[PDB]
């Protein structure tokens, strides 16, 4: 009955959740900003920010690990090469959410989640 329990079941099963957030940390990283529902965005921060953190240390281990999550070398290239050194000195909060209204086709609360500097 939830007491002190973290993590959002997003009406999916365990594997699917994992697949999706893997598939979506890669998105946010690739595009630095993506638009999603608010709940997913809020969870995304838990998957993604600890990749960033991991990337603050370049090492064959950490890259491989980074590859275990994500499983995409373009993305593990971008952390480590770009994003790790961007956020080098900032302690967490590598990401920010901007709420942005309601999805037409089903009314889902949406939000942008973006890296904290973009420029892109």
């Amino acid at each position: 009955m939830r007491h002190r329990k973290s993590g959002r079941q997003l009406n999916r099963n365990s594997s699917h959740r994992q697949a999706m957030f893997r598939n979506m940390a890669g998105s946010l990283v690739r595009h630095e900003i993506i638009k999603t529902t608010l709940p997913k965005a809020k969870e995304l921060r838990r998957v993604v920010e600890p990749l960033i953190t991991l990337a603050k240390t370049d090492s064959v281990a950490n890259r491989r690990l980074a590859f275990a999550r994500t499983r995409d070398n373009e993305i593990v290239a971008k952390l480590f090469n770009e994003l790790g050194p961007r956020f080098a000195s900032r302690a967490g909060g590598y990401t920010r959410i901007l709420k942005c209204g309601f999805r037409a086709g089903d009314n889902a609360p949406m939000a942008y989640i973006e890296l904290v500097d973009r420029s892109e």
Binding site: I33, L98, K99, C100, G101, Y112
Partner: protein, 56 residues
């Protein structure tokens, strides 16, 4: 399990005693662009609290 007597129009009324929607009263205007928006939400031109975030 179905009703034995047809419920009255009055009763229909009372049951809907609580489905008025509530208007929002929370719109704010962005200082730097003057478009309306919900509190803590970005504007349609992607302004939030003055700064232009987003940009699409």
């Amino acid at each position: 399990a179905v009703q034995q007597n047809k419920p009255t129009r009055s009763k229909r009324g009372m049951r809907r005693s609580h489905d008025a929607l509530t208007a929002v009263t929370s719109l704010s205007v962005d200082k730097t662009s003057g478009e309306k928006h919900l509190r803590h939400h970005i504007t349609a031109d992607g302004y939030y609290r003055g700064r232009k975030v987003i940009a699409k």
